[PDB]
Amino acid sequence: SMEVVGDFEYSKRDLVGHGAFAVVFRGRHRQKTDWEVAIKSINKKNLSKSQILLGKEIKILKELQHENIVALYDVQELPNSVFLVMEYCNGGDLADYLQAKGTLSEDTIRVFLHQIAAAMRILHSKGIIHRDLKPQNILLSYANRRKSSVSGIRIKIADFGFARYLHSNMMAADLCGSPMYMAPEVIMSQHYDAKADLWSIGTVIYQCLVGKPPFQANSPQDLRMFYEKNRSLMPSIPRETSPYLANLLLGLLQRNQKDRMDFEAFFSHPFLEQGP
Amino acid sequence: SMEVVGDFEYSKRDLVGHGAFAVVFRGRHRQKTDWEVAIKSINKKNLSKSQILLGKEIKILKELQHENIVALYDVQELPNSVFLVMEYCNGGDLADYLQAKGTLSEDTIRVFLHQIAAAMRILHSKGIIHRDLKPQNILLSYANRRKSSVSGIRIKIADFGFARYLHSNMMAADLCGSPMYMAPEVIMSQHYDAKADLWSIGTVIYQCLVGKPPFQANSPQDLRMFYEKNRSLMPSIPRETSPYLANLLLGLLQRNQKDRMDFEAFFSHPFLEQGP
Ligand SMILES: O=C(NCCCNc1nc(Nc2cccc(CN3CCOCC3)c2)ncc1C1CC1)C1CCC1
Ligand SMILES: O=C(NCCCNc1nc(Nc2cccc(CN3CCOCC3)c2)ncc1C1CC1)C1CCC1
Ligand SMILES: [Cl-]
Ligand SMILES: [Cl-]
To answer: Is residue A18 within 6 Å of ligand 1 at its C-beta?
Structure first.
């Protein structure tokens, strides 16, 4: 029993992930059957009870077209559900890759980070923040399943469900007329969460290096309060960590956004600029 | 020549406002012709080139149903355009009312502010900020055109095109799974623009009292830079202003968001709690 979604199909058995409002299946083109796809099914009624808008991810994925961001191939609307047909990542997620490898070398981390940074450059230039980056939505794709080493992995960022747009300066003036009544922080495009992804990336790199996240907690409750109470945190960096990677990690893992490394500093951090 | 929009109609001659992506016409129910409506026409192609999502205003207007917020009656989608059929405000905007009256008494300001505050309470409870409040989208409605004095005016907030949702604490955990990789400012719901509307309201009240906005500028450019350069501003309050209204104005018109009065303080400000 295959479900049909435009020119594609999937089995409901082939679940490859899910969240509150969506499930994702491995599927394929119905005729070009070696063209695998990831089909995301969103329940409309469940979604309208959140603040999440239905067309946000669609629009973002079209605007973010790039080799380190999952592609969107088709949208199919039904009475109850919307289907997004997107790029399938045949390597699964970074979480599983880490479980299998334990910890990554600094050389491997550098290669992955170069790709994550490329993704982040395209988000940055469109004023998009992801806000929920984690090993579960940083995905691995192998172009040939023969080339199965690090140099055959292409990283692709997924799940923009919790993402948001940041306006620029005239992005406020150009559509909202005279700004005379507009709050200064809106006119000036001041955004508390503009560096959210940089923290995330920090936690992920740290976990690649060390084998655990830098600040664990038994629940969402504990982690909120731990971050509430401790207004300044030092992650534990192993002594063996190269000086520049440690510098990068401590810059990313700044509890206070204003003290956190910004994108240009991240993109041009000396750890990232290397040869082999 | 009347255009038809579901059970309603309008003339293209009866333009009552516009912006970058929309025009609004006075119209009416086709059979109950004394039921006036405001019909907003949005060009789809123009809109998709902005960051603005098409269904945002629709969803917000449904969630904000309230007597000081324009109602949404119908949505009609066409190949090129979406039409929103909304509550018509037969009194026009506050801008025109101010042009005609010059300046308002403190008693009148108190009555208008009570209604604006009621609107703000419903936004606040749904975590919505408007971000572009101004005299042009704070509208006047008269239920009987006979009762034409202040006590016959009902204030209604309009144009949520530039509005945004703020998540709550578990609004992050409840949909985005484990928050272990999530930025602290995202987990904690820290928002630079959470008080944007309070500044706006400040500028509007000030203009009602004084007859001009507190910080004029020849362009959007000047106003941005003036706010960039001057990190602390004192609005000029007339000596005749009642002490508590002056206090309220200076609390709202804080250039720096962190020093600005918050919603609960605004809603319970002693100027607002009065009898006649
Ligand atoms: O997209 C989400 N999470 C990311 C993981 C699931 N989605 C994807 N998974 C994948 N592939 C995948 C993810 C996890 C596991 C696997 C299955 N493994 C493949 C290799 O090893 C065998 C099993 C494959 N590719 C693409 C995608 C996204 C839609 C474009 C959210 C879950 C609701 C949306
Ligand atoms: O909604 C917008 N701006 C607010 C003013 C235009 N819209 C409205 N105007 C009004 N009425 C209105 C506004 C300005 C002028 C007038 C015309 N006057 C009526 C009384 O005196 C005679 C002329 C009437 N009512 C409702 C609405 C909004 C859609 C629900 C934006 C313009 C693109 C969206
Ligand atoms: Cl957004
Ligand atoms: Cl939003």
So the answer is: yes
Which among A165, A187, A196 has the least Cβ separation from residue B183?
Answer: A196
Quick one: which of B208, B180, B199 has its CA closest to B258?
B199
Cα–Cα nearest to B24, from B42, B36, B7, B8: B42
CB A215: neighbour CB atoms within 10 A? 20
**CA–CA distance, A66 with A58 (Å, rounded to integer):** 14
DSSP string, chain A: --EEETTEEEEEEEEEEE-SSEEEEEEEESSSTT-EEEEEEEEHHHHTTSS--TTHHHHHHHHT-BTTB--EEEEEE-SSEEEEEEE--TT-BHHHHHHHHSS--HHHHHHHHHHHHHHHHHHHHTTEE-S---TTTEEEEESSSS--SGGGEEEEE---TT-EEPP-SHHHHHHH---TTS-HHHHTT--TTTTHHHHHHHHHHHHHHHSS-SS--SSHHHHHHHHHH-SS------TTS-HHHHHHHHHH--SSGGGS--HHHHHT-TTT----
Inter-residue contact A237 to A251 (CB < 8 Å): no
Q: How far apart are CA A223 and CA B186, in angstroms?
A: 12
Residue A226: Cβ within 10 Å count: 15
Residue type, A258: K
Identify the nearest ligand to the CA of A72 by its number. 1
Our CA angle for B96, B101, B107, nearest 5°, is 115
The beta-carbon contacts of A26-34 under 8 Å, at least 24 apart in sequence, are A26/A88, A27/A85, A27/A88, A30/A4, A31/A7
Q: How many CB atoms lie within 10 A of CB B169?
A: 15
Instruction: Determine contact: B203 vs chain A, CB below 8 A.
Output: yes
> What was the resolution (in A) of this experimentally determined structure?
2.5
Nearest 5°: phi and psi at A268?
Answer: -100, 15
C-beta separation of B108 from B116 below 8 A = no
Give Cα B139 distance to the centre of its chain: 9
The secondary structure of B91-155 as a DSSP string is T-BHHHHHHHHSS--HHHHHHHHHHHHHHHHHHHHTTEE-S---TTTEEEEESSSS--SGGGEEE
**B132 annotated active-site:** yes
CB-defined site of ligand 2, < 6 Å? B 16-19, 22, 24, 38, 40, 70, 86-93, 136-137, 139, 158-159
Helix/strand/coil percent split, chain B, to 5 = 35, 20, 45
Burial class (CB in 10 A: 0-12, 13-18, 19+), A45: exposed
Single-letter code of the amino acid located at A273:
E
Which helix (H) or strand (E) segment holds residue B36: the answer is: strand B36-43
Q: Which domains, ranges and CATH numbers included, belong to chain B?
A: 3-92 (no CATH), 93-276 (1.10.510.10)
DSSP string, B203-254: HHHHHHHHSS-SS--SSHHHHHHHHHH-SS------TTS-HHHHHHHHHH--
For residue A161, give Cα distances in angstroms to A50, A53, A91, A166: 11, 9, 22, 15
